[PDB]
């Protein structure tokens, strides 16, 4: 410390996954529409920049002081 689903709609969602697996699992649908991919790339590059600026540098290290 600092929306429970019913079994009916549970089975309906399961059967929806069943019939979506029967007809065609088109893997080419995983390709983004080049708009969400820009957001994903921006998020990943910003996280990389933060982590790389943190982990750029980590016997004591040399100091600029005399």
């Amino acid at each position: 410390t600092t929306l429970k689903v019913s079994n009916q709609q549970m089975l309906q969602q399961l059967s929806l996954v069943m019939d979506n697996l029967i007809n065609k699992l088109d893997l080419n649908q995983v390709v983004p529409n080049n708009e969400v991919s820009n957001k994903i790339n921006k998020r990943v590059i910003t996280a990389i920049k933060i982590n790389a600026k943190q982990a750029k540098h980590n016997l004591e290290v040399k100091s600029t002081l005399p």
């Binding site: 929306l3 089975l11 399961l14 996954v17 699992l25 790339n41 990943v44 990389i48 933060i50």
Partner: protein, 302 residues
């Protein structure tokens, strides 16, 4: 350079994914995460000729190895269903067809056993089973220097809160993966931004934590940040932002613990002195002399 083993621990629960479908605008996100996982496994098998794939699903009533099939089931089988097109690469096709066939069987089992609602999540047991399989592939040593990597595709969907029973098995899996040098990447699909145990799993085992809110474009997340091969782990930085504090929850209050007291017998963490001067976990009676020093107020002149 060196081939690796990618063991996928996917947490498919009909209650968990239904909550994500209700919260999201789209429906049937199981198909989307499954096809993203299939493309990611085909990508991993394309990385090296000698790499291997393990897929284990944690459902409500237990765990089951999606790929490869059971040896009794392999001997029993082969009805080649047309879920996946047959004109693709055969190495990808066998893995994809086996995976979707075991999705079919496991969802038929879930539909059959839908009347019983389980309050015990089996994600940690699935991670333990994946670690046993990783040790088997290392111990078997059919192939020289196989490396390894766990990838846990879990979903919280804002419904399943933090599970305190999972804490010890997840920590044991962390220590086991650190012993065998197996990085654990975690993808969480849901509204819960922070998952403390899984973030600790990614941080302590040199893995990558990645929380997403939409199942669309998931292969763009997997092939970019989860494609860190164990051969190239130290030379590639990890995008796992949001560093975890490595703290723990108290035993009798449940809050995240500040400076506090633990039992010297059972190591249970207490945010405050427990009532009755006895440990709530292992029932060890505390000495009244020593706890008065902890209760002693600090000194300053008038």
């Amino acid at each position: 350079e060196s081939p690796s083993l990618l063991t996928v621990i996917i947490e498919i629960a009909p209650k968990l994914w239904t909550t994500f479908d209700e919260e999201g605008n789209e429906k049937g996100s199981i198909i989307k995460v499954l096809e993203a996982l299939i493309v990611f496994l085909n990508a991993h098998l394309a990385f090296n000729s000698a790499n291997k794939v393990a897929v284990i699903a944690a459902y409500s009533q237990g765990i089951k190895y999606l790929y490869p099939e059971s040896t009794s089931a392999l001997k029993a089988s082969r009805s080649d269903l047309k879920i996946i097109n047959s004109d693709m690469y055969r190495r990808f096709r066998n893995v994809d067809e086996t995976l979707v066939e075991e999705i079919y069987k496991l969802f038929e089992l879930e539909k059959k056993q839908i009347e019983q609602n389980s309050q015990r999540s089996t994600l940690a047991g699935a991670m333990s089973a994946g670690l046993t399989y990783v040790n088997r592939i290392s111990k078997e040593s059919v192939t020289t220097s196989l490396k390894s990597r766990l990838l846990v595709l879990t979903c919280g969907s804002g419904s399943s809160k933090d599970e305190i029973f999972q804490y010890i098995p997840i920590m044991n899996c962390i220590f086991s993966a650190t012993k065998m040098k197996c990085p654990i990447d975690v993808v969480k699909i849901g509204g819960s931004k922070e998952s403390t145990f899984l973030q600790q799993t990614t941080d302590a085992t040199n893995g990558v934590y990645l929380h997403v809110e939409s199942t669309e474009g998931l292969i763009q997340y997997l092939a970019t940040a989860m494609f860190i091969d164990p051969s190239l782990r130290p030379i590639i930085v990890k995008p796992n932002h949001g560093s975890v504090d490595f703290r723990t929850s108290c035993y009798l209050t449940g809050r995240v613990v500040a400076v506090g007291f633990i039992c010297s017998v059972c190591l249970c963490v207490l945010s405050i002195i427990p009532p009755g001067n006895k440990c709530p976990a292992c029932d060890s009676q505390f000495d009244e002399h020593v706890i008065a020093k902890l209760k002693r107020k600090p000194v300053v002149p008038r």
